[PDB]
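re: ur msg from earlier - yeah i can do the WKR complex, just paste it... oh wait u already did. ok heres what im feeding in:
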Amino acid sequence: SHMCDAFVGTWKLVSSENFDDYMKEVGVGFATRKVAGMAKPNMIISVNGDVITIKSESTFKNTEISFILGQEFDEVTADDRKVKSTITLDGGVLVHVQKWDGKSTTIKRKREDDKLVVECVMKGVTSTRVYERA
Ligand SMILES: CC(C)(C)Sc1nc(=S)nc(-c2ccccc2)[nH]1
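and the outut:
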């Protein structure tokens, strides 16, 4: 057993708060905000050796990242930014930093009770997204 055992599985979005304001702060345009904000993604997390894979499947986009903790990778996000990302484990929380165009956003994922809670921060603006097991 390991690092991210408690994250592994298939998860479904059940609530979102402040996501439009987070996307505004990130610089997402109107049409993408409206459509992306409607999405109810499933998130599929798996581990194979040192490689973690996170898939998001939704009506908007299907995305997948695979990474090793601490090791930077390039990501094209669901809203089409070209970012450089590094994901680490800090006290049991997966911390995902995305950098582009001199900007940065941090996405934290943690297990709380039977949920997976995702907190997305851009400057002073936070969005909280809660997932339950599918
Ligand atoms: C910002 C958006 C929704 C316009 S674009 C986008 N693309 C990818 S791939 N991932 C995300 C993402 C990942 C984790 C938490 C919140 C968002 N967003």
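cool cool. Helices lie at 19-26, 30-38. ping me if u need the other ligands too
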